Design an enzyme around this catalytic site. Structure first.
Site, PDB file in Angstrom:
ATOM      1  N   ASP A  16       0.865  -1.188   0.000  1.00  0.00           N
ATOM      2  CA  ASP A  16       0.000   0.000   0.000  1.00  0.00           C
ATOM      3  C   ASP A  16       0.900   1.236   0.000  1.00  0.00           C
ATOM      4  OD1 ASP A  16      -1.898   2.205   1.215  1.00  0.00           O
ATOM      5  OD2 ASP A  16      -3.211   0.524   0.735  1.00  0.00           O
ATOM      6  N   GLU A  18       2.061   5.185  -0.090  1.00  0.00           N
ATOM      7  CA  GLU A  18       1.658   6.579   0.022  1.00  0.00           C
ATOM      8  C   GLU A  18       2.451   7.388  -0.994  1.00  0.00           C
ATOM      9  OE1 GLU A  18      -1.016   7.216   1.707  1.00  0.00           O
ATOM     10  OE2 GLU A  18      -0.964   5.206   2.604  1.00  0.00           O
ATOM     11  N   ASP A 115      -2.483   1.138  -6.885  1.00  0.00           N
ATOM     12  CA  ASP A 115      -1.062   1.059  -6.554  1.00  0.00           C
ATOM     13  C   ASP A 115      -0.245   0.439  -7.684  1.00  0.00           C
ATOM     14  OD1 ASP A 115      -2.878   0.897  -4.133  1.00  0.00           O
ATOM     15  OD2 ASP A 115      -0.975   1.442  -3.186  1.00  0.00           O
ATOM     16  N   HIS A 173      -4.308   6.030   5.989  1.00  0.00           N
ATOM     17  CA  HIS A 173      -3.392   6.732   5.090  1.00  0.00           C
ATOM     18  C   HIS A 173      -1.939   6.675   5.550  1.00  0.00           C
ATOM     19  CE1 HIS A 173      -7.024   8.189   3.201  1.00  0.00           C
ATOM     20  NE2 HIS A 173      -7.404   8.712   4.354  1.00  0.00           N
ATOM     21  N   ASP A 178      -2.094   0.659   6.654  1.00  0.00           N
ATOM     22  CA  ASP A 178      -3.043   0.146   5.673  1.00  0.00           C
ATOM     23  C   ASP A 178      -2.730  -1.312   5.351  1.00  0.00           C
ATOM     24  OD1 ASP A 178      -4.408   2.574   5.598  1.00  0.00           O
ATOM     25  OD2 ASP A 178      -3.598   3.213   3.674  1.00  0.00           O
TER      26      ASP A 178
END
Ligand SMILES: Nc1ncnc2c1ncn2[C@@H]1O[C@H](COP(=O)(O)O)[C@@H](O)[C@H]1O
Ligand SMILES: [Sm+3]
Ligand SMILES: [Sm+3]
Length: 201
Positions: A16, A18, A115, A173, A178
């Site tokens: 995941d 960011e 992603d 987030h 996550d």
């Protein structure tokens, strides 16, 4: 059905990202957090963790919005390797974990397709970097959940936790948090008897 049935993969690789962002959206976006959780393919237990923050280059200064959204502060990306080097660290980590053996079966799991369908290939194309073959197949947890529960979750991890009566892990987030929620949802879906399948085309 049988709880925790045999699965098609020896390991699941939960990921995941960011990325840099702003209001309205920054362009281009750049990965700033790169987490991978290696889950035991049968029990879904976390056995290893890759985690690196990444130094963005095109927009090197994180916006106030990005830091508010993700909790990632400037000092966490300053001095870090860029995406090119982090991808080399991932490849070394995959090798040491034993995941490059053709007879060891693994697949990435993400919440949504963004992603690995959009973010990673788009930045790699921008940088002129090839995408490793193991990033090209994945399981979209929201699609897997929709087959396991018969319903389409509205808002990602929060609504999948809601549907399964799971308490949310950590901070939304945050990439690593996550991932922990993805892994916890997967464990519950396997407990209910779900057999995971590739969803990417
Ligand atoms: N509400 C939002 N507004 C703008 N960008 C967002 C928003 N939510 C997520 N993003 C971007 O998408 C990335 C992945 O989001 P997430 O995995 O939901 O934390 C973030 O690191 C941001 O770059
Ligand atoms: Sm996410
Ligand atoms: Sm996230």
């Amino acid at each position: 059905s049988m709880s925790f049935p045999p699965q098609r993969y020896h390991y699941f690789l939960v990921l995941d990202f960011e990325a840099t962002c702003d209001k309205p959206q920054i362009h281009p976006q750049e990965i700033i957090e790169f987490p991978i959780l290696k889950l035991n393919g049968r029990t879904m237990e976390i056995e290893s963790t890759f985690h690196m923050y990444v130094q963005p280059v095109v927009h090197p200064q994180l916006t106030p919005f990005c830091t508010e959204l993700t909790g990632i502060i400037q000092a966490m990306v300053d001095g870090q390797p860029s995406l090119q080097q982090v991808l080399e660290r991932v490849d070394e980590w995959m090798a040491k974990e034993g995941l490059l053996d053709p007879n060891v079966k693994s697949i990435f799991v993400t919440c949504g397709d963004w992603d690995l369908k959009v973010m990673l290939p788009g930045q790699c194309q921008y940088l002129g970097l090839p995408v490793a073959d193991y990033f090209k197949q994945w399981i979209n947890l929201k699609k897997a959940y929709s087959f396991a529960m018969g319903c389409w979750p509205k808002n990602g991890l929060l609504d999948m936790n809601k549907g399964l009566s799971l308490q949310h892990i950590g901070r939304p987030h945050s990439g690593i948090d996550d991932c922990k929620n993805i892994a916890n949802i997967m464990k519950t879906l396997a407990y209910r008897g779900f057999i995971f399948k590739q969803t990417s085309k």
